[PDB]
Amino acid sequence: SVRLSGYCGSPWRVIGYHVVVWMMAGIPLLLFRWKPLWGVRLRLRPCNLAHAETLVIEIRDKEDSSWQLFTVQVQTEAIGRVLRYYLFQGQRYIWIETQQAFYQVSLLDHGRSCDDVHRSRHGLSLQDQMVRKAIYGPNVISIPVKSYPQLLVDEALNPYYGFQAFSIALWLADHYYWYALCIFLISSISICLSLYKTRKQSQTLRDMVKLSMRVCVCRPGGEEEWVDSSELVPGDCLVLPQEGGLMPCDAALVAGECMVNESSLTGESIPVLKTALPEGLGPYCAETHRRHTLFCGTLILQARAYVGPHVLAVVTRTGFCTAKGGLVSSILHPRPINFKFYKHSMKFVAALSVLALLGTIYSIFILYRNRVPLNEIVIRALDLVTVVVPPALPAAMTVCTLYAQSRLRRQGIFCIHPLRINLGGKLQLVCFDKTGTLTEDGLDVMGVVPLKGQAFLPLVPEPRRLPVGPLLRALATCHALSRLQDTPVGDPMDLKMVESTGWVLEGTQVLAVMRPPLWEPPPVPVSVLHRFPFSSALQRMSVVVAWPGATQPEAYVKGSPELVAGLCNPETVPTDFAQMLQSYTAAGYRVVALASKPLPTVPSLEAAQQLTRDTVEGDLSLLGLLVMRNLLKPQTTPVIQALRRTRIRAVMVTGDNLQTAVTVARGCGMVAPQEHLIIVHATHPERGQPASLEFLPMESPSRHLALSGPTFGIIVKHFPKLLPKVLVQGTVFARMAPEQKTELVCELQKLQYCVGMCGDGANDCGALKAADVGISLSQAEASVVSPFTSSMASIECVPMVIREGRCSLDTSFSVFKYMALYSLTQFISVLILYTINTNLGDLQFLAIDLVITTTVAVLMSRTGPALVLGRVRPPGALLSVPVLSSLLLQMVLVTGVQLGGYFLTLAQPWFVPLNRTVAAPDNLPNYENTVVFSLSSFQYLILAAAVSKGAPFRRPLYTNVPFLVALALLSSVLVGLVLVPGLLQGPLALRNITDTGFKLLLLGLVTLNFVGAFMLESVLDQCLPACLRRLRPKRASKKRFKQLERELAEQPWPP
Ligand SMILES: *[C@@H]1O[C@H](CO)[C@@H](O[C@@H]2O[C@H](CO)[C@@H](O)[C@H](O)[C@H]2NC(C)=O)[C@H](O)[C@H]1NC(C)=O
Ligand code: ALF
């Protein structure tokens, strides 16, 4: 469905439109452009799609008519005859000139037979390498680092900077030099900080994503060590390293068997067995199988060659095509954040521009009636537009976030992009990674089962209180651990077993001698006679150990419990073992069984110790099983209760097994004991019969759903109508691919849920960016991508960022209301004086614009958040009846006092009219200016105090002593300026009033509007919500999640 079009034109015609916009640099274009689509369409000069410079790709969603616009450069490279390559949206769409046909990179895949990949077991000649290198590019994910001019274009395209630039120009023209400098300097640091930050993030991301490991391509002429790094081709063959190696390319292992860590892909640190691909005549690609294939970013722990000279693999995917590359494409190319407040603010700012256009005509006509010079009128008309639309408004709103960032830094939460703190306020759903976020990172031995008799025996709580004798020996001496300088080096689970007992590891053939904790309530310090490894096929490791009693040694074999049972004698094995194993597996307790064979072998003789691995392990008595699980965390259960009490929903997104997710979620309190959990499985249509949705309930002593990634895939394609019904009711998503984690967050946010991701990353990094609020719980990988990074290493960060957001959004509402009211009250004062051929004097404007607004705006935004989270949520809508009503009614009172005062001043007999001949600047001292300015000054202080709500989301206003002091000291200066004739009257161009009575009445008008404003705001705040229900009782929410929850209330999908 993509709309791809070719382009060419006359060089003079291209230079012509470069004279129109490129000389202008675009900043006028956007000043005359609502949106660029109309311009974009035919700005570029069209041609045959055969030959092009850039390509207009317009991608349409047919269903929603989603005609998204893109323009993409044409790559021309010579293999030996030039081939056309197009780098669309990251990925390579390759154009064959001969067939006039676009073909995307990875269209090679035709379901290439398992046998086809086997046929290409060895990489072809330098001619094949040469062309493949041209077809697929280098084996790298190329993150572009853009230039300061290119970054400056995108930042400075923002229309407000255009308006600020226009404003600063007019201010330098009208001689308002002091404030002009302040707005320019504030802008300069803001743009610079944005540019510096933008470059740094790309630089760090480019550094992090780049992998530089030298590899050995396998070719009969070409199979040599470290022959290349970035040259490895999608068809090429490679030798897997015999030890630890980080895989550069997604590949399939032709020969041998390997153990890999998939922590990048899944987030589970436990090693996974990969075996040599069976040669398959059937035309099947490995994509579906996903089983015998090692992915880019995975670590090969162990690589074992048995059938061949070395472990041998064939590449499948390279560069941007690999899954890692898919995630890099996911973290690049980001959709903008949809926030009702920010768009509604721009609509309100636009509405003020319509009032400015009206104001300009009133200014023009009345000044023309005043018969002022034409020159004056054009500067003054424009000046009013800058009075109406406040040029500092963005800078003011940032001050709220800047404070909240500082509080968060003290709490240990390091937040880049502080405007994202506001999004914290609106969060309705927090999505959680399981491993190293909600649960503890390493599996911990919970207990051991004795098997004393024929049947199994009860689990022992404390390994430190080891039962003294053979179990105590077995647990202490069951080590694969290598001795290190004041440390045991080895596998964490093996370390945990040794640690949990409390025994410490320090003859001719005596190896790694085992000793006690050095408290006696048996010390019996013991030597390991023989040691046999945990081969992945075998699933068993055997340690022969002899205690210092001149006794027969015992051989302890630790293995997978079924294999241990198979090896173990049937009299030793219990019938209940299967049920016990099943129960512990279902509980999420890792079951690893240790068996004992009494051995009639002379100790300290290598001949006696030496036997066949299978013969030693062949028949034994099961000594016990070992049970290990994640312990949730200390603070995990509390945080989830608070979120659930607040009515914020919690969705467990894990890359782990669904059975584990079910038990941890129940423990977490995501699913409470009363709450009923349904398991949803979708069977794919492999037989051609269409896909079947199956719903199975879970029994335990707000109905919600548990899903797997495969199921999610089948629902996202084969049940599109039902996906919404899943998403609004699904609380556990398990075995989810790192792409699927992003996709969950994408489909949640299209349902109008404001969504927050908390995770330790490398798998959820995509979700961390995608989510409106992204919290990293690790300083590596996650930290770089996440807007918010904790160092606390708990879920307890999530409530703090909600609280800080709720304060920040409520403060941001008040600061916008203040900045709106200040611009309008100045707009009234300027127009009121303009009617009489007068203006607010220079240095009077400076008093209001510089000293008053800055002081109240900086000091009103200090208020920290409310102590405890409440069910009520801060409003998201700035363009709404409650806020607009407050502004309209406040302005009526404000206009009232000013007009009343002016006419009262006219009414008094001492009053003398102004010159009206000489101009607004020329008539420096005048009663009308003095009374308007004197009344107006107090209103800016009054409005600031009135708009600060405080109590529900922030600490009480009285707690903000600095703000009250600031208002008190500023109020004193103003009250002094009216009451006493002062030197300052000369600089501020104010005429003293003889009648103290009139001045006391003028203060009277101030105290009327003070009491009035506070009462007017309070009464509206109290009654308007009640009035809303009276006016519209049946009023229903527009948010899609709210509607779907209602539908579900009427009739339940999977009942
Ligand atoms: C108001 O405007 C000015 C204030 O300085 C004064 O007007 C000037 O007065 C002188 C005589 O003192 C005349 O020669 C000028 O023609 C006046 N010019 C203008 C432009 O007004 C005076 O105080 C007031 N003007 C009038 C006309 O009374
Ligand atoms: F640690 Al996870 F999905 F549970 F990355």
Ligand SMILES: [Mg+2]
């Ligand atoms: Mg994790």
